[PDB]
């Protein structure tokens, strides 16, 4: 962890286009739009509402470091993703077919690209059958 705690702060204040210790939530709506997102101001104010645990909106990484210091791979956020398959499960066992996973992948929430969702179920359907099991996916999401 000693080799990443220095150069990350170069990207932390990179959105403000200056040297100030600011996460720049007002300028994040221009930085992400320059990247090609262009969100609304309601979702933009919702970003640092839970990302920045301080509460101001622009920070010298109390929680911008803690956002990096949350690996999202241990057993505290591995069952919450495993519950997201359970909302789609019918008749138990994690039955989810490639057609049903493509049906739910390109339709709801924040949709993926077709070049992403076409190959997303590829490593989770190595047997080629009609059941993309959740345990074969969270094992791929174990390093996420």
């Amino acid at each position: 962890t000693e080799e990443q705690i220095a150069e990350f702060k170069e990207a932390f204040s990179l959105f403000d286009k200056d040297g100030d210790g600011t996460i720049t939530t007002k300028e994040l709506g221009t930085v992400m739009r320059s990247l090609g997102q262009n969100p609304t101001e309601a979702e933009l104010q919702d970003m640092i509402n839970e990302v920045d645990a301080d509460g101001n909106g622009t920070i010298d990484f109390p929680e911008f470091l803690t956002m990096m210091a949350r690996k999202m791979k241990d057993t505290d956020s591995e069952e919450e993703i495993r519950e997201a398959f359970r909302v789609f499960d019918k008749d138990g066992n994690g039955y989810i077919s490639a057609a049903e996973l493509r049906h739910v992948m390109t339709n709801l929430g924040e949709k993926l690209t077709d070049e992403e969702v076409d190959e997303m179920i590829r490593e989770a359907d190595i047997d080629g059958d009609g059941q993309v099991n959740y345990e074969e996916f969270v094992q791929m999401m174990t390093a996420k």
């Binding site: 990207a11 990179l14 930085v31 992400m32 990247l35 997102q37 979702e43 919702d46 970003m47 839970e50 990302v51 956002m67 990096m68 949350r70 999202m72 956020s77 919450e80 993703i81 519950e83 997201a84 398959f85 909302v87 789609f88 739910v104 992948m105 709801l108 929430g109 924040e110 949709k111 993926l112 992403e116 997303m120 791929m140 999401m141 390093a143 996420k144």
Partner: protein, 331 residues
């Protein structure tokens, strides 16, 4: 199409804080135009209903005669019907069959009265209360709660109507020739004794007809208790049935909220793993920030999609059971 798809959301199935002001201050025009139309039959306040009420009725049918055509022309934004031949099945919707009858029949009555005439305006002015409650969201509740409970309703109406047909005949046999305290005979025919049966089986008790002979009072007592119960039954039946259907809509309305927030987590966690491969380098230096940033927003939305349940203390049968399996599962 954008010049027409927004009107279909402004008139039918409407939404937004100004649609309430449109569809309620039309109803508060029908209401005043009904109160002034029916304060004319008091024979002492009849001077208030002058001819300006009639011209306020003809401008009202002028308004509705283009309102129906606006809602007809703005109907082609639907997958169920398109064009002009398809839109006839839009006019099978019985609120529109009611509305067409209202506007054309009130126009026809206003034409012949301008070249018992004013009396027909009262019925076709009462009918305009029904056509501003859109979507039929009230009758769909009752027509399904009655259909779910068809067995008990048919049973108790059959038993109550059998008790009414039977025991309001024995009263007529006990009271066929007996006069009142004022010289008239109450139970003259069977229909008088049946008017009595309906009236006393629903516990009205007007008091025009009371059985005078002491045989008939006993039968009235027996049939009173033993059919007042079976006619007071459907109140409790539909009272359970209405409070059980709205709770069966606040299950699926929460389950419709849970699914896009159980999609926005998995579709974003795959995005957070796809950091290997989506100057082309520093553009990828910024996306690792946003794929970790919005993932936490999706994580908050998913925990706000299941923890607020609705009657929110419904975990009172499975308090320790949701934890007593997981701690066993960790071993």
């Amino acid at each position: 199409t954008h010049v027409q798809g927004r009107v279909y959301n402004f008139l039918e199935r409407p939404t937004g804080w100004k649609c309430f002001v449109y569809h309620f201050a039309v109803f508060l025009i029908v209401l005043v135009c009904l109160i002034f139309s029916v304060l004319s039959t008091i024979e002492q306040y009849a001077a208030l209903a002058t001819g300006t009420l009639f011209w306020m009725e003809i401008v009202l049918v002028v308004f509705f005669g283009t309102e129906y055509v606006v809602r007809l022309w703005s109907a082609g934004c639907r997958s169920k019907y398109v064009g002009l031949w398809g839109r006839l099945r839009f006019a099978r919707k019985p609120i529109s069959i009611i509305d067409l009858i209202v506007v054309v029949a009130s126009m026809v009555v206003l034409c012949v009265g301008s070249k018992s005439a004013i009396r027909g305006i009262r019925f076709l002015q009462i009918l305009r209360m029904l056509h501003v409650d859109r979507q039929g969201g009230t009758w769909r509740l009752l027509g399904s709660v009655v259909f779910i409970h068809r067995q008990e309703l048919i049973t108790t109406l059959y038993i109550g109507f059998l008790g009414l047909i039977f025991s309001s005949y024995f009263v007529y046999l006990a009271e066929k020739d007996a006069v009142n305290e004022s010289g008239r005979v109450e139970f003259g025919s069977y229909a008088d004794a049946l008017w009595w049966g309906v009236v006393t089986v629903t516990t009205i008790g007007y008091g025009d007809k009371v059985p005078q002979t002491w045989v008939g009072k006993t039968i009235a007592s027996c049939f009173s208790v033993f059919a007042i119960s079976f006619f007071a039954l459907p109140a409790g039946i539909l009272g359970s049935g209405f409070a059980l259907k709205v709770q069966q809509k606040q299950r699926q309305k929460h389950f419709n909220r849970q699914i896009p927030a159980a999609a926005s987590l998995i579709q974003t966690a795959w995005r957070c793993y796809a950091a290997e491969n989506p100057l082309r380098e520093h553009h990828r230096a910024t996306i690792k920030v946003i794929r970790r940033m919005q993932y936490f927003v999706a994580k908050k939305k998913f925990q706000q999609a299941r923890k607020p349940y609705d009657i929110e203390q419904y975990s009172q049968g499975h308090l320790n059971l949701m934890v007593r399996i997981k701690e066993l599962q960790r071993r």
